[PDB]
Coordinates of C-alpha atoms and ligand atoms in Angstrom, one line a residue:
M1 CA 39.4 20.6 -8.8
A2 CA 36.8 19.1 -11.1
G3 CA 34.4 18.1 -8.3
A4 CA 32.5 15.0 -7.6
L5 CA 29.5 13.1 -9.0
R6 CA 27.1 12.2 -6.1
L7 CA 24.7 9.4 -6.9
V8 CA 21.4 9.3 -5.1
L9 CA 19.0 6.3 -5.5
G10 CA 15.2 6.2 -5.0
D11 CA 15.3 5.0 -1.4
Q12 CA 18.0 7.6 -0.4
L13 CA 15.9 10.7 -0.3
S14 CA 17.3 12.3 2.9
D15 CA 19.0 15.6 3.3
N16 CA 21.4 13.9 5.7
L17 CA 22.4 11.2 3.3
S18 CA 26.1 10.3 3.7
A19 CA 26.9 10.9 0.0
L20 CA 25.5 14.5 0.2
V21 CA 27.2 15.5 3.5
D22 CA 30.4 17.4 2.5
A23 CA 29.2 18.5 -1.0
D24 CA 30.9 21.4 -2.9
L25 CA 27.9 23.1 -4.6
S26 CA 30.2 25.2 -7.0
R27 CA 31.8 22.1 -8.5
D28 CA 29.8 18.9 -7.8
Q29 CA 26.8 17.3 -9.5
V30 CA 24.1 15.0 -8.1
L31 CA 22.8 12.2 -10.3
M32 CA 19.3 10.7 -10.0
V33 CA 17.9 8.2 -12.5
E34 CA 14.4 6.8 -13.1
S35 CA 15.6 3.2 -13.9
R36 CA 13.5 0.7 -15.7
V37 CA 15.9 -2.0 -14.6
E38 CA 15.1 -1.3 -10.9
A39 CA 11.4 -0.8 -11.6
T40 CA 11.0 -4.1 -13.4
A41 CA 13.5 -6.5 -11.6
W42 CA 10.2 -7.4 -10.0
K43 CA 7.1 -6.0 -11.6
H44 CA 6.4 -3.8 -8.6
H45 CA 3.0 -2.6 -7.5
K46 CA 1.8 0.4 -9.5
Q47 CA 1.6 2.3 -6.2
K48 CA 5.3 1.7 -5.4
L49 CA 6.3 3.2 -8.8
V50 CA 4.2 6.4 -8.1
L51 CA 5.5 6.8 -4.6
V52 CA 9.2 6.5 -5.5
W53 CA 9.2 8.6 -8.6
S54 CA 7.0 11.3 -7.2
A55 CA 9.3 11.4 -4.2
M56 CA 12.4 11.5 -6.4
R57 CA 11.3 14.4 -8.6
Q58 CA 10.2 16.4 -5.5
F59 CA 13.5 15.5 -3.7
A60 CA 15.4 16.7 -6.8
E61 CA 13.6 20.1 -6.7
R62 CA 14.5 20.6 -3.0
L63 CA 18.1 19.9 -3.9
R64 CA 18.0 22.5 -6.8
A65 CA 16.5 25.1 -4.4
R66 CA 19.6 24.6 -2.1
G67 CA 22.0 25.4 -5.0
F68 CA 22.8 21.8 -6.0
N69 CA 23.4 21.0 -9.6
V70 CA 21.2 18.0 -10.4
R71 CA 21.4 15.8 -13.5
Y72 CA 17.9 14.1 -13.4
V73 CA 17.2 11.4 -16.0
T74 CA 13.4 10.7 -16.4
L75 CA 11.9 7.4 -17.7
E76 CA 10.8 9.4 -20.8
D77 CA 14.3 10.5 -21.7
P78 CA 15.0 8.6 -25.0
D79 CA 18.8 8.5 -24.3
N80 CA 18.3 6.9 -20.9
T81 CA 20.2 3.6 -20.9
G82 CA 17.8 2.1 -18.3
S83 CA 20.4 1.2 -15.7
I84 CA 22.3 2.9 -12.9
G85 CA 25.7 1.8 -14.2
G86 CA 24.9 2.8 -17.7
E87 CA 23.8 6.3 -16.6
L88 CA 26.9 6.6 -14.4
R89 CA 29.0 6.2 -17.5
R90 CA 27.0 8.6 -19.7
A91 CA 27.3 11.2 -16.9
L92 CA 31.0 10.8 -16.6
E93 CA 31.2 11.2 -20.4
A94 CA 29.4 14.5 -20.4
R95 CA 31.9 16.5 -18.2
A96 CA 35.0 16.0 -16.1
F97 CA 34.9 14.6 -12.6
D98 CA 37.5 13.8 -9.9
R99 CA 35.5 10.8 -8.5
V100 CA 32.1 9.2 -7.8
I101 CA 30.6 9.3 -4.3
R102 CA 27.7 7.1 -3.2
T103 CA 25.9 5.6 -0.3
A104 CA 25.7 1.8 0.0
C105 CA 22.3 0.7 -1.1
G106 CA 19.8 -1.9 0.2
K107 CA 20.1 -4.7 -2.3
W108 CA 23.1 -7.0 -2.1
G109 CA 23.1 -7.8 -5.8
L110 CA 23.1 -4.2 -6.9
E111 CA 25.6 -3.2 -4.2
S112 CA 27.8 -6.1 -5.5
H113 CA 27.5 -4.8 -9.1
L114 CA 28.4 -1.2 -8.4
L115 CA 31.4 -2.2 -6.4
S116 CA 32.7 -4.1 -9.4
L117 CA 32.1 -1.4 -12.0
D118 CA 35.1 -0.5 -14.2
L119 CA 35.0 3.3 -14.2
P120 CA 37.5 5.8 -15.5
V121 CA 37.5 7.6 -12.1
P122 CA 37.7 6.3 -8.5
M123 CA 34.5 5.5 -6.7
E124 CA 34.0 6.1 -2.9
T125 CA 31.3 4.1 -1.1
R126 CA 29.9 5.3 2.3
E127 CA 27.9 3.5 4.9
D128 CA 24.2 4.4 5.1
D129 CA 24.2 5.9 8.6
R130 CA 20.5 6.8 8.7
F131 CA 20.2 3.3 10.3
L132 CA 20.9 3.1 14.0
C133 CA 23.2 0.0 13.9
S134 CA 25.9 -0.3 11.3
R135 CA 26.8 -3.5 9.4
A136 CA 30.1 -3.7 11.3
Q137 CA 28.4 -3.1 14.6
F138 CA 26.0 -6.0 14.0
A139 CA 28.7 -8.4 12.9
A140 CA 30.5 -7.6 16.2
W141 CA 27.4 -8.2 18.3
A142 CA 26.7 -11.5 16.6
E143 CA 30.3 -12.9 16.7
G144 CA 30.3 -16.2 18.7
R145 CA 26.6 -16.4 19.3
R146 CA 25.1 -19.8 18.6
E147 CA 21.7 -18.4 17.8
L148 CA 20.7 -14.8 17.2
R149 CA 17.9 -13.6 19.4
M150 CA 16.2 -10.3 18.8
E151 CA 15.3 -9.7 22.5
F152 CA 19.0 -9.5 23.4
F153 CA 19.9 -7.3 20.5
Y154 CA 17.1 -5.0 21.5
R155 CA 18.5 -4.4 25.0
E156 CA 21.8 -3.4 23.3
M157 CA 20.0 -0.9 21.1
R158 CA 18.1 0.6 24.0
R159 CA 21.4 1.3 25.9
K160 CA 23.2 2.5 22.7
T161 CA 20.4 4.9 21.8
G162 CA 19.3 5.8 25.3
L163 CA 15.6 5.4 24.4
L164 CA 13.3 4.8 27.3
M165 CA 16.3 4.8 29.6
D166 CA 16.3 6.4 33.1
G167 CA 20.0 6.4 33.7
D168 CA 21.3 2.9 33.1
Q169 CA 17.8 1.4 33.9
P170 CA 15.0 0.7 31.5
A171 CA 11.9 2.8 32.2
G172 CA 9.4 1.1 34.4
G173 CA 11.8 -1.6 35.6
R174 CA 11.4 -3.9 32.7
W175 CA 12.8 -4.0 29.2
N176 CA 9.7 -5.4 27.4
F177 CA 6.0 -5.1 28.2
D178 CA 4.7 -7.5 25.5
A179 CA 2.0 -9.7 27.1
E180 CA 0.8 -12.8 25.2
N181 CA -2.7 -11.8 26.4
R182 CA -4.0 -10.0 23.3
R183 CA -7.4 -10.5 21.6
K184 CA -9.7 -9.6 18.8
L185 CA -11.7 -6.4 18.6
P186 CA -14.9 -6.0 20.7
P187 CA -17.9 -6.3 18.4
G188 CA -19.0 -2.7 18.9
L189 CA -15.6 -1.0 18.5
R190 CA -15.3 0.5 15.1
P191 CA -11.7 1.4 14.2
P192 CA -10.9 5.1 13.5
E193 CA -10.6 6.7 10.1
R194 CA -7.0 7.2 9.0
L195 CA -5.4 10.2 7.4
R196 CA -4.7 9.6 3.7
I197 CA -2.7 12.1 1.6
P198 CA -4.4 13.4 -1.6
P199 CA -1.9 13.6 -4.5
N200 CA -0.1 16.8 -5.0
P201 CA 0.5 18.1 -8.6
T202 CA 3.7 16.2 -9.1
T203 CA 2.2 13.0 -7.7
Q204 CA -0.8 13.3 -10.0
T205 CA 1.4 13.7 -13.0
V206 CA 3.4 10.5 -12.2
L207 CA 0.2 8.5 -11.6
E208 CA -1.0 9.2 -15.1
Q209 CA 2.4 8.2 -16.6
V210 CA 2.3 5.0 -14.6
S211 CA -1.3 4.1 -15.4
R212 CA -0.6 4.3 -19.1
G213 CA 3.0 3.0 -19.3
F214 CA 3.0 0.2 -16.7
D215 CA -0.5 -1.3 -17.0
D216 CA 0.7 -4.9 -16.9
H217 CA 1.9 -4.3 -13.3
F218 CA 0.1 -5.5 -10.2
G219 CA -2.4 -3.5 -8.2
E220 CA -4.7 -0.6 -8.5
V221 CA -3.5 3.0 -8.6
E222 CA -6.8 4.6 -7.7
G223 CA -7.0 5.9 -4.2
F224 CA -3.3 6.6 -3.8
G225 CA -2.9 8.1 -0.4
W226 CA 0.8 7.7 0.5
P227 CA 3.0 10.6 1.5
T228 CA 5.6 11.7 -1.1
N229 CA 7.6 14.4 0.7
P230 CA 8.6 15.2 4.3
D231 CA 5.7 17.5 5.0
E232 CA 3.2 14.9 3.9
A233 CA 5.2 12.2 5.8
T234 CA 5.3 14.4 9.0
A235 CA 1.5 14.8 8.9
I236 CA 1.1 11.0 8.8
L237 CA 3.5 10.7 11.8
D238 CA 1.7 13.5 13.7
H239 CA -1.6 11.7 13.2
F240 CA -0.3 8.4 14.4
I241 CA 1.4 9.9 17.6
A242 CA -1.6 12.0 18.6
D243 CA -4.5 9.7 17.7
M244 CA -3.3 6.2 17.4
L245 CA -0.3 5.5 19.5
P246 CA -2.2 5.4 22.9
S247 CA -4.1 2.3 21.6
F248 CA -1.1 0.8 19.8
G249 CA -0.3 -2.6 21.3
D250 CA -3.8 -3.2 22.6
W251 CA -4.6 -4.2 19.0
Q252 CA -1.3 -4.9 17.3
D253 CA -2.3 -8.5 16.6
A254 CA -6.0 -8.1 15.9
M255 CA -7.5 -8.5 12.4
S256 CA -10.8 -7.1 11.2
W257 CA -12.6 -7.7 7.9
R258 CA -12.2 -4.8 5.4
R259 CA -10.5 -2.5 7.9
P260 CA -6.9 -2.8 6.6
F261 CA -5.1 -0.2 8.7
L262 CA -6.6 -0.3 12.2
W263 CA -4.1 1.4 14.7
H264 CA -0.9 0.9 12.8
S265 CA 1.4 3.8 11.9
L266 CA 1.5 3.3 8.1
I267 CA 4.9 4.8 7.9
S268 CA 7.0 2.0 6.4
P269 CA 6.8 3.1 2.7
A270 CA 8.0 6.6 3.8
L271 CA 10.7 5.4 6.3
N272 CA 12.1 3.0 3.8
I273 CA 12.9 5.8 1.2
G274 CA 14.2 8.3 3.7
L275 CA 11.3 10.7 4.2
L276 CA 11.4 10.1 8.0
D277 CA 14.3 9.3 10.3
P278 CA 14.1 6.2 12.7
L279 CA 15.7 8.1 15.6
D280 CA 13.4 11.1 15.3
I281 CA 10.3 8.9 15.1
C282 CA 11.3 7.1 18.3
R283 CA 12.1 10.3 20.2
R284 CA 8.7 11.7 19.4
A285 CA 7.1 8.5 20.7
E286 CA 9.1 8.6 23.9
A287 CA 8.3 12.3 24.5
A288 CA 4.6 11.3 24.3
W289 CA 5.0 8.9 27.2
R290 CA 7.2 11.4 29.1
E291 CA 4.6 14.1 28.8
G292 CA 1.6 12.0 29.8
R293 CA 0.0 11.6 26.3
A294 CA 0.5 7.8 25.9
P295 CA 1.0 4.8 28.2
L296 CA 4.5 3.2 28.4
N297 CA 3.4 -0.3 27.2
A298 CA 2.2 1.2 24.0
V299 CA 5.3 3.4 23.4
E300 CA 7.8 0.6 24.1
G301 CA 5.9 -1.8 21.8
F302 CA 6.2 0.7 19.0
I303 CA 9.9 1.6 19.6
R304 CA 10.7 -2.2 19.9
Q305 CA 9.6 -2.6 16.3
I306 CA 11.9 0.0 14.9
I307 CA 15.2 -0.2 16.9
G308 CA 14.6 -3.9 17.5
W309 CA 13.0 -5.9 14.7
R310 CA 13.7 -3.5 11.8
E311 CA 17.4 -3.1 12.7
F312 CA 17.7 -6.8 13.6
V313 CA 16.6 -8.1 10.2
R314 CA 18.7 -5.7 8.2
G315 CA 21.7 -6.9 10.3
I316 CA 20.9 -10.5 9.5
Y317 CA 20.5 -9.8 5.8
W318 CA 23.9 -8.2 5.3
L319 CA 25.6 -10.7 7.7
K320 CA 24.3 -13.7 5.8
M321 CA 24.1 -12.8 2.1
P322 CA 24.5 -14.0 -0.6
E323 CA 23.9 -17.5 0.8
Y324 CA 20.8 -16.5 2.8
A325 CA 18.9 -16.1 -0.4
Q326 CA 19.5 -19.6 -1.5
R327 CA 18.5 -21.6 1.7
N328 CA 15.5 -23.9 1.5
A329 CA 15.6 -25.6 4.8
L330 CA 12.3 -27.6 4.5
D331 CA 12.9 -28.5 0.8
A332 CA 9.7 -26.7 -0.3
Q333 CA 9.1 -27.2 -4.0
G334 CA 5.5 -26.2 -4.5
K335 CA 4.0 -23.6 -6.8
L336 CA 2.2 -20.5 -5.6
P337 CA -1.6 -20.6 -5.8
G338 CA -3.1 -18.2 -8.3
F339 CA -5.4 -16.6 -5.7
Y340 CA -2.4 -14.9 -4.2
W341 CA -2.5 -12.7 -7.4
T342 CA -6.2 -12.7 -8.1
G343 CA -7.8 -12.8 -4.6
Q344 CA -10.3 -15.3 -5.9
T345 CA -10.5 -17.8 -3.0
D346 CA -13.3 -18.7 -0.5
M347 CA -10.9 -18.4 2.4
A348 CA -12.1 -15.0 3.7
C349 CA -8.9 -14.2 5.6
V350 CA -6.6 -14.8 2.6
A351 CA -9.0 -12.9 0.3
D352 CA -9.2 -9.9 2.6
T353 CA -5.4 -9.8 2.9
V354 CA -4.9 -9.9 -0.9
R355 CA -7.6 -7.3 -1.4
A356 CA -5.7 -4.9 0.7
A357 CA -2.4 -5.6 -1.1
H358 CA -4.2 -4.9 -4.4
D359 CA -6.1 -1.8 -3.4
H360 CA -3.7 -0.1 -0.9
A361 CA -0.3 -1.9 -1.5
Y362 CA -0.3 -2.6 2.2
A363 CA -1.4 -5.2 4.8
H364 CA -0.5 -5.0 8.5
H365 CA 2.1 -7.2 10.2
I366 CA 0.0 -10.1 11.5
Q367 CA -1.6 -10.7 8.1
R368 CA 1.8 -10.7 6.4
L369 CA 3.0 -13.2 9.1
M370 CA 0.1 -15.3 10.1
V371 CA -2.2 -15.4 7.0
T372 CA -0.3 -15.3 3.7
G373 CA 3.1 -16.1 5.1
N374 CA 1.9 -19.0 7.3
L375 CA -0.2 -20.5 4.5
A376 CA 2.7 -20.5 2.0
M377 CA 4.8 -22.3 4.6
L378 CA 2.2 -25.0 5.2
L379 CA 1.5 -25.5 1.5
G380 CA 5.2 -25.9 1.0
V381 CA 5.6 -23.2 -1.7
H382 CA 9.2 -22.7 -3.0
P383 CA 10.6 -19.7 -1.2
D384 CA 11.7 -18.1 -4.5
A385 CA 8.1 -17.9 -5.5
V386 CA 7.0 -16.5 -2.1
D387 CA 9.7 -13.8 -2.3
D388 CA 8.6 -12.7 -5.7
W389 CA 5.0 -12.1 -4.4
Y390 CA 6.1 -10.1 -1.4
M391 CA 8.5 -8.0 -3.4
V392 CA 5.6 -7.2 -5.9
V393 CA 2.6 -6.4 -3.8
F394 CA 3.7 -4.0 -1.0
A395 CA 4.7 -0.4 -1.2
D396 CA 7.4 -0.8 1.5
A397 CA 9.1 -3.7 -0.3
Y398 CA 12.9 -3.9 -0.3
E399 CA 15.1 -7.0 -0.2
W400 CA 17.0 -6.3 3.0
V401 CA 13.7 -6.3 5.0
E402 CA 11.5 -8.5 2.9
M403 CA 13.9 -11.5 2.8
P404 CA 14.6 -12.1 6.5
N405 CA 10.9 -11.5 7.3
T406 CA 9.5 -13.7 4.5
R407 CA 12.2 -16.3 4.0
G408 CA 12.9 -16.3 7.7
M409 CA 10.2 -15.3 10.2
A410 CA 7.2 -16.2 8.1
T411 CA 8.3 -19.5 6.4
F412 CA 11.3 -20.9 8.3
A413 CA 13.1 -21.5 4.9
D414 CA 16.2 -20.2 6.6
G415 CA 16.0 -22.8 9.3
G416 CA 15.4 -20.5 12.2
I417 CA 18.1 -17.9 11.9
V418 CA 15.7 -14.9 12.3
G419 CA 12.8 -16.2 14.3
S420 CA 13.6 -19.2 16.4
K421 CA 10.7 -21.5 15.6
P422 CA 8.2 -22.0 12.8
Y423 CA 5.4 -19.6 13.3
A424 CA 2.9 -22.3 12.1
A425 CA -0.7 -22.0 13.1
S426 CA -4.1 -23.6 12.4
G427 CA -7.3 -21.8 11.8
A428 CA -8.0 -21.6 15.5
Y429 CA -5.4 -18.8 15.9
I430 CA -7.0 -16.7 13.1
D431 CA -10.4 -17.2 14.6
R432 CA -9.2 -16.1 18.0
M433 CA -7.6 -12.9 16.6
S434 CA -10.2 -11.9 14.0
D435 CA -13.9 -11.6 13.0
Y436 CA -13.2 -13.6 9.8
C437 CA -14.4 -17.1 10.3
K438 CA -18.0 -16.2 11.1
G439 CA -18.3 -15.0 7.5
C440 CA -16.2 -17.7 6.0
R441 CA -17.9 -20.5 4.0
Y442 CA -15.4 -22.9 5.7
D443 CA -15.9 -24.4 9.2
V444 CA -13.0 -23.6 11.5
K445 CA -14.1 -26.3 13.8
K446 CA -13.7 -29.1 11.3
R447 CA -10.5 -30.6 9.9
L448 CA -11.7 -33.0 7.2
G449 CA -14.2 -32.5 4.4
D450 CA -15.0 -30.0 1.7
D451 CA -16.3 -27.5 4.2
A452 CA -13.3 -27.7 6.5
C453 CA -10.9 -24.8 7.0
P454 CA -7.7 -25.5 4.9
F455 CA -5.5 -24.2 7.7
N456 CA -6.4 -27.1 10.1
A457 CA -5.4 -30.1 8.0
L458 CA -2.4 -28.3 6.5
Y459 CA -1.1 -27.3 10.0
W460 CA -1.0 -30.9 11.1
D461 CA 0.4 -32.3 7.9
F462 CA 3.3 -29.7 8.3
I463 CA 3.8 -30.8 11.9
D464 CA 3.7 -34.5 10.8
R465 CA 6.0 -33.8 7.8
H466 CA 8.7 -32.2 9.9
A467 CA 8.1 -33.8 13.3
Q468 CA 11.7 -35.0 13.3
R469 CA 13.3 -31.7 12.3
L470 CA 11.1 -29.8 14.8
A471 CA 12.0 -32.3 17.5
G472 CA 15.5 -31.0 17.8
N473 CA 14.9 -27.3 18.5
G474 CA 12.6 -27.6 21.6
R475 CA 10.1 -24.8 21.4
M476 CA 7.5 -27.0 19.5
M477 CA 6.8 -29.5 22.2
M478 CA 3.0 -29.2 22.8
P479 CA 2.2 -29.8 19.1
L480 CA 4.6 -32.8 18.9
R481 CA 3.2 -34.7 21.9
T482 CA -0.3 -33.9 20.6
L483 CA 0.6 -35.4 17.3
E484 CA 2.1 -38.3 19.2
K485 CA -1.3 -39.1 20.9
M486 CA -3.0 -39.3 17.5
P487 CA -4.0 -42.7 16.2
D488 CA -2.5 -43.5 12.8
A489 CA -5.9 -43.6 11.1
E490 CA -6.3 -40.0 12.3
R491 CA -2.9 -38.9 10.8
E492 CA -3.5 -40.7 7.5
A493 CA -6.8 -38.8 7.2
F494 CA -5.3 -35.3 7.4
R495 CA -2.3 -36.3 5.3
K496 CA -4.9 -37.3 2.6
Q497 CA -6.9 -34.1 3.0
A498 CA -3.8 -31.9 2.9
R499 CA -2.6 -33.7 -0.3
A500 CA -6.1 -33.1 -1.8
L501 CA -5.8 -29.4 -0.9
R502 CA -2.4 -29.0 -2.6
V503 CA -3.7 -30.4 -5.8
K504 CA -7.0 -28.3 -5.5
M505 CA -4.9 -25.2 -5.0
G506 CA -2.5 -25.7 -7.9
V507 CA 0.6 -26.2 -5.6
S508 CA 1.6 -29.7 -6.7
Ligands
FAD1 C1 6.2 -11.9 5.4 C2 6.5 -10.5 5.8 C3 7.0 -9.5 4.9 C4 7.3 -8.2 5.3 N1 7.8 -7.4 4.3 C5 8.1 -6.2 4.7 C6 8.7 -5.3 3.7 O1 8.9 -5.6 2.5 N2 9.0 -4.0 4.2 C7 8.9 -3.6 5.5 O2 9.3 -2.5 5.8 N3 8.4 -4.5 6.4 C8 8.0 -5.7 6.0 N4 7.4 -6.5 7.0 C9 7.3 -6.0 8.4 C10 6.0 -5.3 8.7 O3 4.9 -6.2 8.3 C11 5.9 -3.9 8.1 O4 7.0 -3.1 8.5 C12 4.6 -3.2 8.7 O5 3.5 -4.0 8.3 C13 4.5 -1.8 8.1 O6 3.3 -1.2 8.6 P1 3.3 0.1 9.5 O7 4.2 1.1 9.0 O8 1.8 0.4 9.7 O9 3.9 -0.5 10.8 P2 3.6 -0.4 12.4 O10 2.8 -1.6 12.8 O11 3.1 0.9 12.7 O12 5.1 -0.6 13.0 C14 6.0 0.6 13.0 C15 7.2 0.4 12.2 O13 8.0 -0.8 12.7 C16 8.8 -1.3 11.6 N5 8.5 -2.7 11.6 C17 7.5 -3.4 12.2 N6 7.7 -4.7 12.1 C18 8.8 -4.9 11.3 C19 9.5 -6.0 10.9 N7 9.1 -7.3 11.2 N8 10.6 -5.8 10.1 C20 11.0 -4.6 9.8 N9 10.4 -3.4 10.2 C21 9.4 -3.6 11.0 C22 8.4 -0.5 10.4 O14 9.4 0.5 10.2 C23 7.0 0.1 10.7 O15 6.7 1.2 10.0 C24 7.1 -7.8 6.6 C25 6.6 -8.7 7.5 C26 6.4 -10.1 7.2 C27 5.9 -11.0 8.2
DLZ2 C1 10.8 1.3 -8.4 C2 12.2 1.8 -8.2 N1 12.7 2.6 -9.0 C3 13.9 3.1 -8.9 C4 14.4 4.1 -9.9 O1 13.8 4.4 -10.8 N2 15.7 4.5 -9.6 C5 16.5 4.1 -8.5 O2 17.6 4.6 -8.4 N3 16.0 3.3 -7.6 C6 14.8 2.8 -7.8 N4 14.2 1.9 -6.9 C7 15.1 1.5 -5.7 C8 16.1 0.5 -6.2 O3 15.6 -0.4 -7.2 C9 16.6 -0.3 -5.0 O4 15.7 -1.3 -4.5 C10 17.1 0.5 -3.8 O5 18.0 1.6 -4.2 C11 17.8 -0.4 -2.8 O6 18.9 0.3 -2.3 C12 13.0 1.4 -7.0 C13 12.5 0.4 -6.0
SF4_3 S1 -12.3 -20.6 8.6 FE1 -10.2 -20.8 7.9 S2 -10.1 -19.9 5.9 FE2 -12.0 -19.2 6.8 S3 -11.5 -17.2 7.7 FE3 -11.2 -18.7 9.4 S4 -9.0 -19.3 9.3 FE4 -9.5 -18.2 7.3

């Protein structure tokens, strides 16, 4: 008869959050905290701080307008303890409560902490059911599988959700329409201009606080164009579905110099904090095919990324922590080159990717995978140091998605749990998929010398370094026989060049 305290964290900004469902407005209180612990665990991009705190304050006001009683603690409050647990206690001290109700969060370490808290009232923890597959459902699907393959989990999610399903058949007779026949942009095709969101009043206010109080943090705040509330988020989605979706998948893997968005949806920072719903997004993409406004190959490619990849990696994260975060399968011990932070390198592809991280707190998937992720693998950078960079630079960054993608798909530090094979590549891939190398001072045709592209000698040194480990999986066969036909004086030459590059780059 004292009511409940309902905690809401900065990535839980949904009216349908499980902790808010079943609220008694006359008795309960909602707790929302701007936490310097969370905001400095990594020194997150200036644009991530603005996004989350702008969204939080606006989410708080919408709650108040519905009759909710909201205890909102700002980062300028001088009694703010700084932490979620500290502010839980101080709130329970301020009035009587029957219990604390919360929704499981997206960081194993913080989830583990809150479950252990000694509190003077009971605490109920509810599954986050905004996701389409629960933690328990994933564990059940994975039980007894020797390896975990996304394609098979994706078929399960199509049947469970009914997306692109005509009865019990996949639409168009096939599950997947991905063709390995994709290419760079035509020279005359300029990519469209994307809708950016000018800052509303609340967002402007938080941008000034962040520019003064968090100046030591990575990235530029000028140009902030991310959506901070469901109306702004819905406008982004509308623009993607109407103008971009029909050409999605034609260009999902292309890269173009100083055009950082291309035809991608740019929804991840909003989806990851609750401003959009995964199911609603997919249903509006399906209806676009159903009504003749987009081709099926483009709509399936997009839906695959959300009910397939995004659900798959979260499942892996919760199934395999806390040990997943400690695996270093290739014994990588190198340091991270400084140009990851500064962008000061003559490799035009790396430089363009870091520039986008700095200026927009965003780069698109193939750059995260095949440029900065691939490079870190080949250089042999310690995965702890790669995780720290990815968690800093991107506006969408959370551990449950960053880890399996970075420590798994991009760098094989998990030994193939998420992907199935190292996604290693030489400069020839980047040249095929981009317009970068023509403007690069390096020569993508050469492997040795001071003008050679660093990806070429490094690729082969990586293959040579791990030839034996990679021999036992079986999807790496072409590169191994090609290494096998290499005379020894040819191998020694690239081993020497790759060694030279690691010193040059400040890795070892
Ligand atoms: C090394 C590395 C690190 C990454 N770190 C993150 C991260 O911190 N946070 C993050 O959300 N994604 C991460 N990604 C996945 C992907 O790069 C981003 O989701 C995507 O670039 C966001 O752009 P978008 O919204 O324009 O996506 P689109 O290209 O329009 O794709 C649509 C949606 O699919 C989802 N999605 C696509 N690919 C993935 C993926 N591999 N895993 C999860 N969801 C996916 C997102 O919800 C995305 O908004 C990472 C990928 C790699 C290789
Ligand atoms: C920058 C930031 N700030 C806050 C904050 O001030 N308060 C809060 O409750 N959460 C914040 N978050 C999100 C958490 O740190 C964390 O990553 C998610 O809640 C994962 O569930 C983030 C990422
Ligand atoms: S030559 Fe090498 S470093 Fe230069 S843009 Fe091409 S792949 Fe990148």
